[PDB]
Design a protein around this ligand. Structure first.
Ligand SMILES: OC[C@H]1O[C@H](O[C@H]2[C@H](O)[C@@H](O)[C@@H](O[C@H]3[C@H](O)[C@@H](O)[C@@H](O[C@H]4[C@H](O)[C@@H](O)[C@@H](O)O[C@@H]4CO)O[C@@H]3CO)O[C@@H]2CO)[C@H](O)[C@@H](O)[C@@H]1O
Length: 379
């Protein structure tokens, strides 16, 4: 008997240490395997039905609907510590009236800046663009004023949603997946701000997560958009960084980032699903274990009495402010095609292959086509 876990590099060390604690207390060995975050869900979709998925996976709550309706993750039973998690975090992991994960953290992106180049937080996106241009000119191109994973809808959503875009309409009967707002007037305005930054040379079409992240660590990026998951690596790199909400899109109009919840899900096909569930509900969910996880991966705790311990940490304060005007990612099965359609639209936009209106129109048509053909149903 061996419990297997897949998780990104941010959680491997602490989960292997906790796994040794669990073995010391219950005699069940735990094997934690690094999987690059962007491969976890895709690998689980193909491996789990073959009996080759991990017993437990760690990842983001938007996966829940797709995995649940495909029979791949197990509903979490009631347990004594359930009450101790924020309802926002539990709702993110709930679908169709059932909880499908034990959450450990809540998150949203923010503006992260290097104080070697930025002395005050730009008050608006127009000010940010001007400061970034100033930096690009002042240091001769050696330092990037602003860089982020621009073609990735997760990171460009703050602009698209902030102006009034939405994924699916909220209704008293749940999300209406036939009412898609990713090509509305606000979505277009937000994507046009992105294209304006490309036009003014503040962003480039080749910018991606790795180029942004390594440049910031090297001390050669003044401003980026990233989450609290990366702050430990910037501390280790020696960057004197600051954190603030993404500057207002217009005076008095905030950016609207996605809110994500990270948590543990149980493979419904696993022969070890009973003990895996016990590991989550009776061990991972404890206050002591959740605090150990925070110290190693210091995202906002999903457990209220753990957040209370760390509420004055300046990173916690700044990322809480950034998330405060955000919106949680949808977790319905129909969220599955949204990422690729909008990512393709953003690539088209930043490469000048089509107008913003045409690219977003095509993205919405693609999403509707994927929903109508049931792209979220695998068999
Ligand atoms: O079609 C493209 C891909 O679309 C889907 O990926 C989505 C995810 O489902 C979303 O959750 C989100 O991903 C975020 C993530 O929520 C956020 O935490 C952050 O990820 C961190 C990670 O937590 C951390 O531990 C470490 O590993 O670094 C990651 C960042 O590199 O950022 C993610 C965004 O990159 O958005 C993506 C789309 O970008 C789908 O699940 C994929 O299968 C699909 O390929």
């Amino acid at each position: 008997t061996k419990l297997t876990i897949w998780c990104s590099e941010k959680q491997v060390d602490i989960l292997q240490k906790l796994g040794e604690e669990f073995k010391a207390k219950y005699g069940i060995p735990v094997e934690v395997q690094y999987v690059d975050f962007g491969s976890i869900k895709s690998k689980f979709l193909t491996a789990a039905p073959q009996g080759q998925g991990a017993d437990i996976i760690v990842g983001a709550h938007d996966w829940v609907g797709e995995l649940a309706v495909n029979g791949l993750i197990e509903p979490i039973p009631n347990f004594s510590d359930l009450k101790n998690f924020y309802d926002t975090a539990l709702k993110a992991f709930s679908y169709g009236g059932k909880l499908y994960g034990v959450p450990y953290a809540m998150e949203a992106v923010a503006l992260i800046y290097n104080k070697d180049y930025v002395d005050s937080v730009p008050k608006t996106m127009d000010e940010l663009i001007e400061k970034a241009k100033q930096i690009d000119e002042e240091y001769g191109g050696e330092v990037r004023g602003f860089i982020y994973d621009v073609a990735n809808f997760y990171f460009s959503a703050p602009f698209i949603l902030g102006y009034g875009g939405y994924v699916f309409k909220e209704t008293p009967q749940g999300l209406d997946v036939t009412d898609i707002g990713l090509a509305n007037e606000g979505a277009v305005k937000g994507a046009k701000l992105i294209k304006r930054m490309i036009d003014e040379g503040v962003l480039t079409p080749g910018d991606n997560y790795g180029t942004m992240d390594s440049m910031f660590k090297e001390g050669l990026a003044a401003m980026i958009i990233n989450g609290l998951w990366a702050i430990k690596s910037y501390k280790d790199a020696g960057i004197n960084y600051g954190v603030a909400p993404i500057p207002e899109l217009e005076p008095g109009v905030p950016a609207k980032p996605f809110v994500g919840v990270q948590g543990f899900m149980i493979n419904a096909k696993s022969p070890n699903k009973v003990i895996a569930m016990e590991f989550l509900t009776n061990f991972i969910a404890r206050k002591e274990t959740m605090y150990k996880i925070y110290l190693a991966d210091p995202r906002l705790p999903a457990r209220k009495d753990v957040l209370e311990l760390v509420k004055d940490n300046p990173d916690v304060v700044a990322f809480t402010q950034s998330a405060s005007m955000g919106t949680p990612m949808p977790n319905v099965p129909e969220m599955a095609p949204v990422w690729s359609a909008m990512g393709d639209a953003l690539s088209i936009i930043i490469n000048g292959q089509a107008s913003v209106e045409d690219a977003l129109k095509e993205a919405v048509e693609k999403i509707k086509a994927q929903i109508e053909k049931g792209s979220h149903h695998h068999h």
